[PDB]
Amino acid sequence: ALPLDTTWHRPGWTIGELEAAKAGRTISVVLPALNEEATIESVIDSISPLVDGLVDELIVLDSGSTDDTEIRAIASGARVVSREQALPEVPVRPGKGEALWRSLAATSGDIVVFIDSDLINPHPLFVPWLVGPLLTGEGIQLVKSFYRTGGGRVTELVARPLLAALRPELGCVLQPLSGEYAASRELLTSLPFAPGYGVEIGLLIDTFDRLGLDAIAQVNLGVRAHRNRPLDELGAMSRQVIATLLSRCGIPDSGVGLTQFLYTRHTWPVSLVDRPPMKVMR
Amino acid sequence: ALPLDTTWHRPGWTIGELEAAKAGRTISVVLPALNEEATIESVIDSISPLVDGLVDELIVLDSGSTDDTEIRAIASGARVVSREQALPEVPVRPGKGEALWRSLAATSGDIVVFIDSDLINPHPLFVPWLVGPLLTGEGIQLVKSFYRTGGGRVTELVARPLLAALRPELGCVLQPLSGEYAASRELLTSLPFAPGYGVEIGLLIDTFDRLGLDAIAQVNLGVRAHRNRPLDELGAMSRQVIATLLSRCGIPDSGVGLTQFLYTRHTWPVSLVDRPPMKVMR
Ligand SMILES: O=c1ccn([C@@H]2O[C@H](COP(=O)(O)OP(=O)(O)O[C@H]3O[C@H](CO)[C@@H](O)[C@H](O)[C@H]3O)[C@@H](O)[C@H]2O)c(=O)[nH]1
Ligand SMILES: O=c1ccn([C@@H]2O[C@H](COP(=O)(O)OP(=O)(O)O[C@H]3O[C@H](CO)[C@@H](O)[C@H](O)[C@H]3O)[C@@H](O)[C@H]2O)c(=O)[nH]1
Ligand SMILES: [Mn+2]
Ligand SMILES: [Mn+2]
Numbered sequence: 001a002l003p004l005d006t007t008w009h010r011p012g013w014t015i016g017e018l019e020a021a022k023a024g025r026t027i028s029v030v031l032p033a034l035n036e037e038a039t040i041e042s043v044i045d046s047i048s049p050l051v052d053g054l055v056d057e058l059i060v061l062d063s064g065s066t067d068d069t070e071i072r073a074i075a076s077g078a079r080v081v082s083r084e085q086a087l088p089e090v091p092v093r094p095g096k097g098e099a100l101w102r103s104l105a106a107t108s109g110d111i112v113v114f115i116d117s118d119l120i121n122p123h124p125l126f127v128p129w130l131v132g133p134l135l136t137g138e139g140i141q142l143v144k145s146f147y148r149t150g151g152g153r154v155t156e157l158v159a160r161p162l163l164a165a166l167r168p169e170l171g172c173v174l175q176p177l178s179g180e181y182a183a184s185r186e187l188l189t190s191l192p193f194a195p196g197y198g199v200e201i202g203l204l205i206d207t208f209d210r211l212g213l214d215a216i217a218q219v220n221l222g223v224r225a226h227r228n229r230p231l232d233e234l235g236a237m238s239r240q241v242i243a244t245l246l247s248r249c250g251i252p253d254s255g256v257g258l259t260q261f262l263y264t265r266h267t268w269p270v271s272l273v274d275r276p277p278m279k280v281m282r
Numbered sequence: 283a284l285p286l287d288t289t290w291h292r293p294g295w296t297i298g299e300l301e302a303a304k305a306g307r308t309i310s311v312v313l314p315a316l317n318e319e320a321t322i323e324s325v326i327d328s329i330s331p332l333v334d335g336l337v338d339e340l341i342v343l344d345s346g347s348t349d350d351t352e353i354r355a356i357a358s359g360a361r362v363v364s365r366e367q368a369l370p371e372v373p374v375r376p377g378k379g380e381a382l383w384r385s386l387a388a389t390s391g392d393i394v395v396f397i398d399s400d401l402i403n404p405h406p407l408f409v410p411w412l413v414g415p416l417l418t419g420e421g422i423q424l425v426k427s428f429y430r431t432g433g434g435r436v437t438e439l440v441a442r443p444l445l446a447a448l449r450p451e452l453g454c455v456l457q458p459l460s461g462e463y464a465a466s467r468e469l470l471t472s473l474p475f476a477p478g479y480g481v482e483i484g485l486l487i488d489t490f491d492r493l494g495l496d497a498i499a500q501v502n503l504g505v506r507a508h509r510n511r512p513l514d515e516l517g518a519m520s521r522q523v524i525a526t527l528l529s530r531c532g533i534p535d536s537g538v539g540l541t542q543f544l545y546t547r548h549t550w551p552v553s554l555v556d557r558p559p560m561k562v563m564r
Contacts, residue, residue, distance in 0.1 A: 008545065146543075151513040157439050161521040161540050164552075165528060168538040174545075231433040239443040246447060251533055256450040258443050261428075263290065263456075270446075 002172040005140065005217040011132045018128055019054045021135040028057040028109025029127060031078075032099040033117035037067040039227075040117050044076040046124040047115065054128065057109055060117065061086065063099040069117075081106045087281070095196030095240075097275065104189055104278045112188055116179035120225040130182040133217035141187040141215045142207045146174035147224040158238045159201055159245070166249045167205060173218060176204050177241070180221060187211075189278040195271040197237040198244030202274070205248040232260055236268035243270050284454040287422065287499040293414045300410055301336045303417040310339040310391025311409060313360075314381040315399035319349040321509075322399050326358040328406040329397065336410065339391055342399065343368065345381040351399075363388045369563070377478030377522075379557065386471055386560045394470055398461035402507040412464040415499035423469040423497045424489045428456035429506040440520045441483055441527070448531045449487060455500060458486050459523070462503060469493075471560040477553040479519040480526030484556070487530040514542055518550035525552050 029047055033040055040060065051058055060073045060080045070080050083092040086102035100114060111134055113127055126145075133140045155177045163170045170176065177200045187207065194202030207216060229237075239258040246253045259267045311329055315322055322342065333340055342355045342362045352362050365374040368384035382396060393416055395409055408427075415422045437459045445452045452458065459482045469489065476484030489498060511519075521540040528535045541549045 153435060153513065154439055156513055156517045156542075157436055157520045158443075160542075161440075161517060161524050164521060164538050164540045165524050165535050166533075168536040171538065171541050174543050231435065231438055235438045235443060238439045239446060242443050242447050251448075253447050254450040256446050256453065258446045259453050260438075260442075261456050 004172050004213050005133060005137065006172075007132070007217070007219045009220065011129050011219065013128065013132055013136065015050070015054055015128055018131065018135055022054075025110040025135075026056045026108065027054060027111045027113065027131060028059070028107035029055050029113045029115065030059055030061055030100065030103040030107060031115050031117040032061045032063055032096060032103065033065060033069050033073070034063040035065045035067045035069060036117040037065075037069050037072055039120060040069055040073050041076050043115060043117050043119055043122050044073060044078045046122045047127055048077055049124065050127060054131075057107055059103065059106055061099045061103040061106065063096070064092075064094075093195065095271070097193050097195040097197075097199035097202075100199055101193035101275045101278065104185070105281070110185050111182055112185055113182040114179060116226065118227045123222060126180060126221055129219050129221055130180065132219060134182055134184065137217065139214050140217045141184045141211060142203070142217070143182045144173060144175060144204065144216070144218045145178045145180040145221045145224075146218055147178075147221045150228045152177070154234050154238045154241060159241055162242070162245055166245070167208065169213065170204065170208055173204065173216075175218075176201055180224075187215075192274040192276050194244040194274050196240045198240045201241050202244045202248060205245070209248070232262065235260060239268065239270050243272060247272065286454050286495050287415060287419065288454075289414070289499070289501045291502065293411050293501065295410065295414055295418065297332070297336055297410055300413065300417055304336075307392040307417075308338045308390065309336060309393045309395065309413060310341070310389035311337050311395045311397065312341055312343055312382065312385040312389060313397050313399040314343045314345055314378060314385065315347060315351050315355070316345040317347045317349045317351060318399040319347075319351050319354055321402060322351055322355050323358050325397060325399050325401055325404050326355060326360045328404045329409055330359055331406065332409060336413075339389055341385065341388055343381045343385040343388065345378070346374075346376075375477065377553070379475050379477040379479075379481035379484075382481055383475035383557045383560065386467070387563070392467050393464055394467055395464040396461060398508065400509045405504060408462060408503055411501050411503055412462065414501060416464055416466065419499065421496050422499045423466045423493060424485070424499070425464045426455060426457060426486065426498070426500045427460045427462040427503045427506075428500055429460075429503045432510045434459070436516050436520045436523060441523055444524070444527055448527070449490065451495065452486065452490055455486065455498075457500075458483055462506075465489075469497075474556040474558050476526040476556050478522045480522045483523050484526045484530060487527070491530070514544065517542060521550065521552050525554060529554065
């Protein structure tokens, strides 16, 4: 009942049916990871059985981990790609947005699926459930998940109310910041990639501004648990989500970083520099 | 070390000294309340000993309570003023901003102090600590508190990061949404009053835009505990805080209310209608 293809229930397709509908299209899965040694294995394990079938490629984009993320992920059979390796001609910047952007150059799938590597016990139907609308539907180029400490505080207090205020047509997207989603390569390599934690909200809005809702679907993945960061780390994330949201809506951002008083004072980085469409690097 | 008079430590003044420095100025205290039967008595009790001394007036602005807020507050010796009684010629709208605005017409103090009526065990030096800079300093017309479930989520994830983005000069205010603050009547009756939960962020920004930081002081009240609302109630608050913040910064707000999916759907009210400076009602 939303102006937006929303699969509220457990999708009916089977792996064999979904695989049939590929029709020569390839599927790449990317797990971005920064210091996720405790959950990375269970996430890979939940997806690796699809490889050489529904999924043609799985990588861990290691965003500079200093723990045992890489050795654990290799031991799980995964190809692990550093940011450097993904695109060596261009120096590495920090943040998640950098990692997803770069992952576009280390993959070749007509469809790209992103799964966060800190999920606690991810269901192995996550990927099949996300490529569903891209395969069977028409016009769909972006599929966002929804679900459910916690509650998605930055989602419920910042991104959703801000979308209500500045892009109300996106008010029917239930989890605009979700790290689990899939999209066509043609769309992904045509859009710029916001830095740090701005990347999701930036892709959602440029996708909308460029193609309208009809290109966007969302799908219930059920329940979703992950690391629940402390409030001060979220402030920093929220600051970046805000900077990216305002820019896509034509509003000048001060570029000034959030300062916190814990009393002691800390100033977190924010970035106004988007990475350009990966096309320009061909 | 901030561009903003910040009393980081327990203020040194005594009640007698502060009272001396009034110099013919009167002090009104206002407790806005909506259904606070469980905490209203302890809050009044913590302040009533100042009446006919440092404080010349105390009221409870009852914002339509359906519990025993009024009878309990009366039994504590407080004058209780309904919104209707505060300003009968003008029909009542909902929200906190309505209540504070109206309270300006039911008081006569040259200085007005606001204290939330849901505080758990408020220190009885709260009021003395807030009128300090208005009495002894010069130029000061607004005094904001700071302190400390929870953590002030809407504060740390929405108001502070948004001020960083759009009014970075206000980045050194530690609790811009705090319900405990004092201000001169001349300032208060000259500013418009945002609706619902937008009122604080609206007063902070119009005060800044109109007088600069030099008119603003903040004071440590130590620790502060209150009702910790559920996340969905905060989304609604956050939506209003956002609508008010964007308007003061010259940015058009859609006027569209936040919708939530709990799955079931609910749409909370937001308002773009500010009450005008109480001066215009003279
Ligand atoms: O510099 C970084 C930071 C994070 N990550 C990875 O990105 C994923 C998500 O990061 P996380 O710290 O867990 O973000 P969340 O607190 O869970 O934030 C949620 O909301 C954010 C705002 O859009 C999204 O970026 C996240 O994917 C989403 O889970 C994890 O696998 C991290 O390893 C990186 O690769 N590089
Ligand atoms: O329609 C209303 C709503 C609330 N209140 C009173 O206002 C005070 C604060 O309301 P509360 O629901 O406790 O807000 P908080 O969740 O604590 O929000 C914090 O941040 C808000 C955003 O600025 C401020 O409005 C609050 O004062 C501040 O405590 C309480 O005494 C309420 O009784 C009313 O009088 N009328
Ligand atoms: Mn996470
Ligand atoms: Mn409260």
